[PDB]
Design an enzyme around this catalytic site. Structure first.
Site, short mmCIF file in Angstrom:
data_model
loop_
_atom_site.label_atom_id
_atom_site.label_comp_id
_atom_site.label_asym_id
_atom_site.label_seq_id
_atom_site.Cartn_x
_atom_site.Cartn_y
_atom_site.Cartn_z
N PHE B 424 47.79 79.43 -15.86
CA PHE B 424 49.19 79.37 -16.24
C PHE B 424 49.62 77.91 -16.46
O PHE B 424 48.97 76.99 -15.96
CB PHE B 424 50.11 80.24 -15.33
CG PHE B 424 50.41 79.68 -13.93
CD1 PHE B 424 49.86 78.50 -13.45
CD2 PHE B 424 51.28 80.39 -13.10
CE1 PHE B 424 50.16 78.03 -12.16
CE2 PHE B 424 51.60 79.94 -11.81
CZ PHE B 424 51.04 78.75 -11.34
N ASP B 449 58.19 82.90 -17.66
CA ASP B 449 58.89 82.01 -16.73
C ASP B 449 57.97 81.47 -15.63
O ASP B 449 58.06 80.30 -15.26
CB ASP B 449 60.12 82.69 -16.14
CG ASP B 449 59.80 83.98 -15.40
OD1 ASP B 449 59.37 84.96 -16.05
OD2 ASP B 449 59.98 84.02 -14.17
N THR B 478 59.94 86.67 -12.57
CA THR B 478 58.81 87.26 -11.85
C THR B 478 57.49 86.73 -12.40
O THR B 478 57.39 86.44 -13.60
CB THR B 478 58.77 88.82 -12.01
OG1 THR B 478 60.09 89.36 -11.98
CG2 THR B 478 57.93 89.46 -10.90
C1 LIG Z 1 46.74 78.29 -12.09
C2 LIG Z 1 47.07 79.75 -11.99
N1 LIG Z 1 47.56 80.30 -10.83
C3 LIG Z 1 47.86 81.65 -10.73
C4 LIG Z 1 47.64 82.49 -11.82
C5 LIG Z 1 47.97 83.99 -11.73
N2 LIG Z 1 48.82 84.12 -12.87
C6 LIG Z 1 48.36 84.33 -14.16
S1 LIG Z 1 49.52 84.33 -15.26
C7 LIG Z 1 50.64 84.07 -14.13
C8 LIG Z 1 52.04 83.99 -14.66
C9 LIG Z 1 52.66 85.37 -14.76
O1 LIG Z 1 54.06 85.19 -14.89
P1 LIG Z 1 54.77 84.81 -16.28
O2 LIG Z 1 54.29 83.50 -16.86
O3 LIG Z 1 56.26 84.77 -16.05
O4 LIG Z 1 54.37 85.96 -17.32
P2 LIG Z 1 54.60 87.53 -17.07
O5 LIG Z 1 53.37 88.11 -16.43
O6 LIG Z 1 55.86 87.70 -16.23
O7 LIG Z 1 54.77 88.14 -18.43
C10 LIG Z 1 50.15 83.95 -12.84
C11 LIG Z 1 50.95 83.68 -11.59
C12 LIG Z 1 47.16 81.91 -13.01
N3 LIG Z 1 46.94 82.62 -14.11
N4 LIG Z 1 46.87 80.56 -13.09
MG LIG Z 2 57.72 86.49 -15.91
#
Ligand SMILES: Cc1ncc(C[n+]2csc(CCOP(=O)(O)OP(=O)(O)O)c2C)c(N)n1
Ligand SMILES: [Mg+2]
Ligand SMILES: Cc1ncc(C[n+]2csc(CCOP(=O)(O)OP(=O)(O)O)c2C)c(N)n1
Ligand SMILES: Cc1ncc(C[n+]2csc(CCOP(=O)(O)OP(=O)(O)O)c2C)c(N)n1
Ligand SMILES: [Mg+2]
Ligand SMILES: [Mg+2]
Lengths: 559, 559, 561
Positions: B424, B449, B478
């Site tokens: 991320f 987000d 979230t």
């Molecule tokens: C460095 C890292 N830590 C934890 C994760 C687990 N993870 C993957 S995507 C992500 C983000 C999900 O949230 P968001 O960007 O808001 O997208 P959404 O799933 O809500 O559509 C997380 C925490 C990751 N991918 N990379």
């Molecule tokens: Mg989100």
């Protein structure tokens, strides 16, 4: 049926852990973090924040703490927090998910890295879970290694399939060490007696106190020894506060930057007439190096540490006392019981120069100066905190060394910064950890624009946890420390490597749900600090600053 | 006299490097970054951003790129960028400072970590400089290893004293490989001929194309082959665009999330009647796994890769062709020259379902749906970009897989995301890299987000470099993907592990000097995008979204 | 029920392995070695012998081979054979037992070491078995990495409990898919690089081909010979590439050793390289120890590197043209590119040939034993008598005498002279002769070894007797680690006996104690008789020869790095 996830959280709880800081990944399919009553997950915006918050909570409590990341980049992000723990010395249990056990092919399986190989060089202990029921013994071994000097992080890699498995799961006592395990050399008592004989002969001894002395529980003992024999106490960055503010033997903390900042021969005034240096709880990683006390006359040295000397190339003490710091002090008290008190060397001109900076009444055209900012923070901290309470936290930068020299510390760990690792962005997580460790004490943070912005997104975490931290961001639109180094090495700057455009940190904080204001002079700053301290919510204050430094006065930094 | 700093930058320039992305620490005393005309330093707010920008620039240019960090925590921060490069496959030269050579005591010297030991497991090559003049050959060896398949990052650790030294420094041709050096097995032509015989007998073959085929320069060749023989082309995430949008043989991209997102037997429709799968430039790290195409009738498989199969436990191809992808296609063209064109299988029900999502005219009671967001981005991208141009970049999250299904890609690497590492926060640096690689093309970014805020401070970098990236932040407060996994594993959510408070990303962007607006429906979003695309400056658009996901539909993620 | 032990042995057999060399420990509770028809255990006296025998069998056959050791010290003993494989380049599957999986605590559990961590830096691949049924895929991945250039050993650690487990094992294996010959890397545009090489050759007055072992692995020997014969280009070799041209071939210019000027008291390197203007290093490998400094004599030269690997040593070797490709592929492309070219006039090395022949013909009787060149001449004579044309192997252990072997030993086929060029562990001789004799069952196998190296690993004489391998061994004895006394004198201009000198060992009596017939030979006549007896015996035989060197420490400047 309870799985390894339950057994893991249960064993952490057995070791006194009540919080797990981190960011959860797809391993959420295997672990919810509601499995065990009394242990809560603390969600951060970045894994670095989680690791550092655990580190700081561990430092203040003196108990093992825990952090969490997902596989691959989760674990590599956490690794900077792990690096903080290994270099700054804190007992942290670092936990990261891994690919399903049968699918572990590092650098080939999606998101799969060789976590143990990556973390092993920067930890006390690193292992991958292989049989679900063994997680209990792996936690015990992690704690065991984390709580042996030099205290540090232990790492467990958790394949997602095994974490969610109940195979072999159906507790023995945890027996968490109340203080760190250390090494003790045969004949340390004879060494301590040699140190006592050196003390008898010395006219101007000093005690140089590091954080390990605090971990040993030796602060009261060190104070009584110093007071009885009239021995000045000099500290590392985080050992500020082992003597109260205003104590006659509180000779302050040292930084290699101090002569350059004060335009004054501070290090020579401190150390020149000293003939015996007792480095009590010495650790090279705290960055109080032998070259810093090697001023003026030749000195005898005594090293006291619950570790064998790792750096004989750099530090060869005349007497090496390898033992528990408190054990040493107690034996030393007996050996020196009949000694006459010493005459201590005069440092009043240094004390005057420091008091001058702090009182600086000048209004500058281009923002405030950092000594004025810290003087303002000291004033409000003294007002807001009960005697012997409160924490000032510093992130990393040129301004940090102003914190080391000038910040109020009225208790052990009353001034917090990262001395070993010194990652920028340290401030926010350290303030989170500090505020949680001391929920009814004021917590102030100072950070520079470069370091603060490197990790500013966790402002949201501060707002979400409603931690009433007061943050001061000193902004000069530069990695200022680095511009100083450019000038030291090259006698000029190169802006593309150090300069930023404008960031409005007031608007930034409010975007995260943190009330904020700008302060441009002492009057506005005191008002903003007093408002923040009484708000019952987090508060942020942006202060424009400039440094106007001279590279010529920083020779003490040379290695 | 020129030092190793000059020799280093000069050798990078010899290999075509014009930019070094990073954050500079105290090694600035040894390197200014103005030593060599033609190389500019690109300062980021975090080292992760530097590493990923270099990775993406290297991917698009097909040339080695460079990133930079300081010792200790600089290097650990950079390592997430190094992990991106190793798993996503890009030729990055990662450079980090180290303690003075005579003072290297890992975990004891201030900020000293064993960088080579930490980075070796996640790199092609890792070395510490020991004799200043050798930096030239170390760079050459770093490039050599980086540009061998599987392409990846090479790491050089640089002790500050040696970096600033002229000792032994008084250039031979660089000979940078134009494309990656690949592994080739004896008898690959024979294997390719066996693949041709399988194609002759097959009724419904498919080409499953991965990123390595693009690196090989095989896109036109693959297209020509697919068109002549009427063979459908299916892609991994970043191989979208190997056929133009609207091409009859463009069967779309695969993601393991597609059945659950579309509420449709998508994998079954794509693969069920297929009898021969040719995985052209196969790489398990891209996460198109054998279990995804193993639907319906029994299939024969042909693996083509410039690497020996690292995963026989998972994938045992009926025919394995170890050779350069372009070399294979050219040989395969000769062997199949007299073949009659195939009847391609029918995926119209899947195409129809995807089109249905994109056209969704409903205005939902809560936020927008991500498919509606992407449809709007597609519309404006098509307007703003020249034919065969433009880049849509996606950060990581649940929304990313909507990007895979729905995002327009009218050129190779027209849709960019991190398929191997998937950290991320990837979005911002990838968009920086993409925009710099394609200075006259529109660059749109979609991020969630959770991931966006993990690395949102580099909005200032976008403003400072004045890169006209248009960013869409899809906000549901979230870590949505993770809440999905909670529900898959446990059939309920646990909010402490996934939920955030409110962040105003509009106000956040403006604090960083980036103009922004909020859009809550198709009309507002289209207007905001059209404004952003014509602005001539960066722009950020916050969109409230919701998922309303059904955990039961995601069984393909398990297998 | 069949266990992982059966699956392991079956998968080795799938990859063509018929022998496992080693020493078995307590893991025998989990593996008997009778589980699978067509694969036999070959028991040695020490694990080093097992690894080296596998290495040499793999070198001559060109196919993956296998060795075995127990946990802890079994594995560490095997690691010198592993180091032999990694530096000498051979596809060896090294297998070692480990503590029960639940009891793996390195440096705490009895006999438990971190095997994977120890072996990973000196191998192509290193893994610990975790789920019994996966042994099949681990062997495949091990073979894959072993058979990719630079070829080398792959290591699998086998916890005793998992080795004895039938969990998840259901006995039909997928195809083994062993590479036909070693896999290599190929640069984009190597053909253009090869054309650049041809352009350099067009202009060159005196080109040479410097051929390394990788050319042999590629199957390029006939192609290189045909190229050299057509264009009249001399062929010069590394140690084990001797025999790429037959003895007596006009273009057989011999092997290079850094020791050659000092052994011959002759400007040998100058004679070999001075007038050369183009050096084509065909299948170059720095590990073979033919270094650029050795050909950098006389006039300025252009260089062409051809190798199935990217250049690992640009600090040392920066070729004018670098052709990264399969050696055979290069030669075939080069043949097309140079089809129109006529033959060069080759440079004259007859003075060097005369000096070498002079040493071999040395008729002097010395007061202090034989001289090594006289010993090798005698071996050459009898080897020539005993072998069919183009057959036979002379094996050399490590020491000062080995470089006499490089200069003087007959090699009438590829690997006709066998020694360890990359690793050079003393004691190499016996296991190499075992491997060579088994690889070439109907050919004469002679071994030369010095007293220092031979006695370091002499116990496996019993293995030679037990396997009844008709190896003829010559032990050249001067009661010294003579090579090391040379280095003492090079560096200090004097000796120090406590670091190099031995007391008396009767190697004749030693051999007989092990059940190997033996004799002492003190002159050419006795030695020829002993060798002829040994060659026709139908059993192993050992000959001890007293020797001395009388070296000149001032003449070894070429050795300096
Ligand atoms: C460095 C890292 N830590 C934890 C994760 C687990 N993870 C993957 S995507 C992500 C983000 C999900 O949230 P968001 O960007 O808001 O997208 P959404 O799933 O809500 O559509 C997380 C925490 C990751 N991918 N990379
Ligand atoms: Mg989100
Ligand atoms: C992870 C990491 N990368 C790089 C550095 C080098 N560095 C140390 S502090 C710092 C920030 C300096 O800027 P600022 O926070 O504004 O404080 P200032 O020096 O301007 O007072 C930097 C870039 C670091 N300390 N940590
Ligand atoms: C495992 C190992 N240890 C040490 C050495 C150093 N060394 C190389 S050859 C050798 C033997 C030299 O003595 P010898 O076998 O009698 O041959 P000589 O030099 O006397 O002719 C020694 C000790 C080595 N080659 N291998
Ligand atoms: Mg600043
Ligand atoms: Mg000898």
């Amino acid at each position: 049926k309870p799985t390894a996830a339950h057994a893991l959280l249960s064993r952490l709880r057995d070791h006194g852990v009540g919080k797990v800081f981190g960011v959860v990944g797809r391993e959420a399919a295997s672990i919810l973090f509601d499995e065990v009553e009394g242990i809560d997950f603390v969600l951060t915006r970045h894994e670095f924040t989680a690791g550092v918050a655990a580190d700081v909570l561990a430092r203040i409590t003196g108990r093992p703490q825990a952090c969490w990341a997902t596989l691959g980049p989760g674990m590599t992000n956490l690794s900077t927090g792990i690096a903080t723990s290994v270099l700054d010395r804190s007992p942290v249990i670092a936990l990261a998910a891994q690919s399903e056990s049968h699918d572990i092919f590092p650098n080939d399986t999606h998101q799969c890295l060789d976590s143990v190989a990556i973390v092993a060089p920067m930890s006390k202990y690193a292992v991958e879970l292989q049989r679900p029921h063994e997680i209990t013994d792996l936690v015990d071994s992690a704690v065991n290694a984390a709580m042996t000097e030099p205290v540090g992080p232990s790492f467990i890699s958790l394949p997602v399939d095994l974490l969610g498995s109940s195979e072999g799961i159906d507790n023995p006592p945890a027996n968490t060490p109340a203080k760190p395990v250390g090494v003790v050399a045969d004949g340390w008592q004879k060494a301590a007696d040699q140190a006592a004989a050196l003390l008898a002969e010395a006219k101007h001894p000093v005690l140089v106190v590091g954080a390990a002395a605090i971990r040993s529980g030796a602060v009261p003992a060190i104070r009584a020894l110093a007071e009885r024999l009239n021995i000045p106490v000099i500290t590392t960055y985080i050992a500020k506060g082992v003597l109260p503010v205003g104590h006659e033997l509180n000779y302050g903390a040292v930084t290699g930057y101090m002569d350059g900042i004060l335009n004054f021969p501070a290090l020579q005034t401190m150390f020149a007439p000293v003939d015996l240096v007792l480095t009590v709880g010495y650790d090279y990683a705290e960055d109080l190096r032998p070259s810093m006390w090697q001023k003026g006359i030749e000195k005898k040295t005594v090293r006291i540490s619950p570790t064998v000397n790792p750096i004989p190339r750099v530090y060869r003490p005349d007497v090496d006392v390898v033992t528990d710091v408190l054990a040493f002090v107690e034996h030393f008290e007996t050996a020196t019981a009949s000694f006459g008190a010493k005459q201590r060397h005069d440092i009043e001109p240094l004390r005057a120069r420091i008091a001058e900076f702090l009182a600086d009444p000048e209004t500058y055209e281009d923002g405030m100066r950092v000594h004025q900012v810290i003087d303002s923070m000291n004033t409000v901290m003294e007002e807001a905190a009960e005697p012997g309470e409160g924490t000032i936290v510093s992130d990393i930068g040129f301004f940090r060394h102003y914190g080391v020299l000038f910040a109020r510390a009225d208790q052990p760990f009353g001034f917090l910064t990262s001395a070993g690792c010194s990652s920028f962005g340290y401030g926010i997580p350290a303030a989170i950890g500090a505020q949680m460790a001391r929920p009814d004490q004021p917590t102030f943070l100072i950070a520079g624009d470069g370091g603060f912005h490197s990790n500013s997104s966790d402002l949201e975490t501060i707002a979400r946890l409603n931690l009433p931290i007061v943050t001061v961001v000193v902004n000069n639109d530069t990695n200022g420390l680095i511009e100083l180094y450019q000038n030291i090495g090259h006698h000029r700057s190169h802006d593309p490597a150090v300069k930023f455009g404008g960031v409005d940190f007031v608007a930034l904080a409010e975007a995260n749900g943190v009330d904020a204001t700008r302060a441009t002079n002492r009057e506005e700053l005191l008002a903003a600090l007093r408002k923040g301290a009484e708000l019952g919510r987090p508060f942020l204050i942006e202060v424009p600053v400039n440094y106007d430094f001279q590279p010529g006065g920083f020779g003490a930094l040379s290695i």
